[PDB]
Amino acid sequence: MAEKVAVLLGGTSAEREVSLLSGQAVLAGLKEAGIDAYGVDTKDFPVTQLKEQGFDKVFIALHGRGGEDGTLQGVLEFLQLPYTGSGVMASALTMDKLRTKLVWQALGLPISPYVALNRQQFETLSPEELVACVAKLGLPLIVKPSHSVGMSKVDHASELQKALVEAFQDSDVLIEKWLSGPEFTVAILGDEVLPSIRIQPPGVFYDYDAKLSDKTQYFCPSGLSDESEQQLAALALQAYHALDCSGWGRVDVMQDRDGHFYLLEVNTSPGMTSHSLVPMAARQYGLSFSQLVARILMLAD
Amino acid sequence: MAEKVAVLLGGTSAEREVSLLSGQAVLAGLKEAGIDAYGVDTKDFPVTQLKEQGFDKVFIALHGRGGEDGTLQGVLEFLQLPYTGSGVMASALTMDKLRTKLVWQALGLPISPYVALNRQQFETLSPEELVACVAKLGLPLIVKPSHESVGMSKVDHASELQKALVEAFQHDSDVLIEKWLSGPEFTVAILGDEVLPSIRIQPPKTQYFCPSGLSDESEQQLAALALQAYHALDCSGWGRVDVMQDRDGHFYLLEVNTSPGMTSHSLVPMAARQYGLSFSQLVARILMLAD
Ligand SMILES: Nc1ncnc2c1ncn2[C@@H]1O[C@H](COP(=O)(O)OP(=O)(O)O)[C@@H](O)[C@H]1O
Ligand code: NA
Ligand code: NA
Numbered sequence: 229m230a231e232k233v234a235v236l237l238g239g240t241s242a243e244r245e246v247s248l249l250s251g252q253a254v255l256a257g258l259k260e261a262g263i264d265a266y267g268v269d270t271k272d273f274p275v276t277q278l279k280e281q282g283f284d285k286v287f288i289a290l291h292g293r294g295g296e297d298g299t300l301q302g303v304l305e306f307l308q309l310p311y312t313g314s315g316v317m318a319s320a321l322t323m324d325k326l327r328t329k330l331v332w333q334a335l336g337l338p339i340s341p342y343v344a345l346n347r348q349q350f351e352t353l354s355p356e357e358l359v360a361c362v363a364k365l366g367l368p369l370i371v372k373p374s375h376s377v378g379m380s381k382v383d384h385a386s387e388l389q390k391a392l393v394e395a396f397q398d399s400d401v402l403i404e405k406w407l408s409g410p411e412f413t414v415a416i417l418g419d420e421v422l423p424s425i426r427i428q429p430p431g432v433f434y435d436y437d438a439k440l441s442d443k444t445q446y447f448c449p450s451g452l453s454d455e456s457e458q459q460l461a462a463l464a465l466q467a468y469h470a471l472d473c474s475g476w477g478r479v480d481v482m483q484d485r486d487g488h489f490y491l492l493e494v495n496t497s498p499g500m501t502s503h504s505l506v507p508m509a510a511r512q513y514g515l516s517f518s519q520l521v522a523r524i525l526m527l528a529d
Numbered sequence: 530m531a532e533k534v535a536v537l538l539g540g541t542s543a544e545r546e547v548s549l550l551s552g553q554a555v556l557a558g559l560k561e562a563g564i565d566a567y568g569v570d571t572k573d574f575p576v577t578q579l580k581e582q583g584f585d586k587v588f589i590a591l592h593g594r595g596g597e598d599g600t601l602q603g604v605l606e607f608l609q610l611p612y613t614g615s616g617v618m619a620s621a622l623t624m625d626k627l628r629t630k631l632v633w634q635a636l637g638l639p640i641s642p643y644v645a646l647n648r649q650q651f652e653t654l655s656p657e658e659l660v661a662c663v664a665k666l667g668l669p670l671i672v673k674p675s676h677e678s679v680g681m682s683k684v685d686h687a688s689e690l691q692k693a694l695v696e697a698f699q700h701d702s703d704v705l706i707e708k709w710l711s712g713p714e715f716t717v718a719i720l721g722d723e724v725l726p727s728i729r730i731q732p733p734k735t736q737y738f739c740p741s742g743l744s745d746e747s748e749q750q751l752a753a754l755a756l757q758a759y760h761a762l763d764c765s766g767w768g769r770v771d772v773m774q775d776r777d778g779h780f781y782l783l784e785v786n787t788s789p790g791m792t793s794h795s796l797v798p799m800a801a802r803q804y805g806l807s808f809s810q811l812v813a814r815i816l817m818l819a820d
C-alpha cells in the first residue's frame with residue numbers, strides 16, 4: 229500500500245540539462261523523506277508506460293516543452309495517475325502569454341498596457357500605421373511572441389518594424405510598455421505564499437540565456453518594505469488562482485517606476501536545483517529541500 | 530505508400546453512443562474520399578499505442594471527457610501524431626466556462642452578465658447575501674458549475690437560488706450565475722478559416738433551422754463574431770460556436786465545442802450540407818487541416 233513514485237526528469241527539451249539536475253535533487257529529497265521514489269529519464273522511457281511500470285504517483289521535475297505545457301499532464305490524466313503541479317488547462321494556458329494576460333485583465337489584475345497582433349493584421353497594415361496602433365503605449369516598448377526567442381527592446385518608432393518581422397516566424401505577438409523593474413518572483417506551495425525574491429539579470433532581459441550565466445543575482449529577502457511584500461503576496465496568489473494553477477508554481481512579477489507591480493507569468497514546473505528560485509524561497513520560509521519536495525508530493529492527489 | 534488514418538471513436542465517456550455513430554459516419558466519409566482509414570474503439574484499444582500499430586494521422590471522433598478536453602490531445606502530442614481539431618490548450622480551455630468568458634470579456638467580445646462564485650464565498654456568505662450578490666442580474670438566472678446538464682438549473686425566484694447553488698457546488702468549486710436570455714440560440718460551425726451557414730435552434734422535440742432566418746447583414750455579423758470567438762480561445766481545425774440572442778437581437782457567446790457530433794443527423798454535417806459539401810468532403814477537409 230505505500231506509493232511508488234516516478235520522478236520525471238531530463239526529457240528532450242532545451243532545458244534537459246537543468247531538468248536532469250532538478251530531478252536528481254528531487255529524487256534525493258524524496259528518498260531522505262522515505263518516499264519510494266525512482267528516477268525516470270523520459271528521454272529514454274516513454275511516459276505512456278508509467279502505469280505499466282508499476283508507478284502510483286508522479287512528481288514532475290521536467291521543464292519546458294512536453295513537461296510544463298499540458299501535454300505530459302494529459303498523458304497522466306489518460307493513465308489516471310496523480311501528479312504534482314498544475315493540471316492540463318493551467319499548464320497549457322500558462323505557456324500562452326496573450327491568454328494569460330487576457331484572463332488576468334478581465335479579472336482586473338494588473339498587467340502592463342499592451343497591444344497584440346495576429347498575422348492577417350501584421351500583413352494588412354502599413355509600417356507607419358503600425359506605430360499609430362502602439363503610440364498610446366509610449367516609449368520604450370518590448371515586442372515578443374505570444375509563446376525565449378524573437379524577443380526585443382524598442383527605444384523609438386523607426387526600430388519597431390524590425391522587431392515585428394522577428395517575432396512573426398507565431399500568429400500572435402505582443403507589444404507592451406517597457407517596465408523599469410525590478411523583477412521579483414513569488415513561489416506558491418499549495419495555498420501558502422513563500423518569501424519573494426528579487427532578481428537582477430546581468431543586463432536587460434531575464435530571458436532563457438540569463439536562466440547559463442553565472443552572473444544573475446537573486447536577493448531573498450527581496451528588500452521590499454513589509455507592506456509592499458504583503459501586496460505582492462496577495463497579488464501573486466490571485467494571479468495563480470486566476471489561471472487555475474494548483475499544487476505549486478512560481479509567479480513572476482515586474483515593478484514599474486510608479487512602484488506598482490505588474491504580472492508577467494506563472495511557471496508551472498519550476499527549477500528545483502539547489503541553486504534554483506523555489507528552493508531558495510522555501511529555505512527562507514523555513515523549509516528544508518526535503519520537506520519542500522515531500523510537501524509538493526503531498527499536494528498531488 | 531498511403532498514410533494510415535485512425536478514426537478514434539466510442540470511448541468511455543457518457544457520450545459513447547453518439548461517438549460510435551460519429552465515428553461510423555466519419556469512417557465511411559473518409560474511405561469514400563479515398564483515404565485509408567480504420568475505425569478504432571478507444572474503449573478496447575489504448576490511444577497510447579496508435580503509433581506502434583502503424584497509424585500516421587488521427588481523426589478524433591470522441592466526445593466529452595477524454596475526447597474534447599485536452600487529455601487525448603496531450604497523448605497525441607506526445608506520440609507526435611497529427612490530429613484533427615484544436616490543440617491541448619484550446620481543447621481544455623473550452624471546458625472551463627469561467628475562463629472562456631474571461632478571455633472573451635477581455636477582448637471586448639459580448640457575453641451575458643454574470644457572477645462567478647467560488648466555494649469559499651459560498652460557505653462564508655449567507656443565503657440572503659448571496660441573493661444580493663446576484664440581484665443586479667435580475668431574474669430568471671442560470672446556475673452552473675464552471676466546468677463541463679449535470680448540476681445546472683434555472684432559478685425563477687430568489688428563494689430558489691440557494692438550492693441551485695447547493696447542487697452546482699457538488700460538481701465544482703467554481704460556479705457561474707448568469708442572466709437568462711430570451712433566445713433564440715444559434716450554432717456556427719467553423720472549418721479551418723471558413724465559417725459555415727449558421728443554424729437556428731428552437732428549444733421545445735427541438736427544431737433545427739438552416740438557413741437560420743437571419744438577414745444577410747446579421748448572418749455576416751454572426752459569422753465574424755463566431756470566428757473571433759473561436760480564434761480568441763486558440764481553436765483550430767474545426768469546431769462549433771454556440772451563440773444566443775437577447776430580446777433586442779444582440780448576440781452573446783455561450784461556448785465553443787472542440788469535437789462536435791458527426792452523426793448523419795448532427796449539426797456540423799447539416800451546416801456543411803447547406804454550404805455545398807457532402808459529409809465525405811466535410812471530413813476530408815477536416816483531416817486535411819491536420820498535419
Ligand atoms: N513589459 C515588460 N517590461 C520590461 N521587461 C519585460 C516585460 N516583459 C518581459 N520582460 C522581461 O523579459 C523577461 C522574460 O519575459 P516573460 O514574458 O516573463 O517570458 P519568457 O519566459 O518567454 O522569457 C522577464 O524576465 C523580464 O526581464
Ligand atoms: Na505551464
Ligand atoms: Na474542448
Ligand code: NA
Nearest residue numbers: 777778779780
Ligand atoms: Na443595441
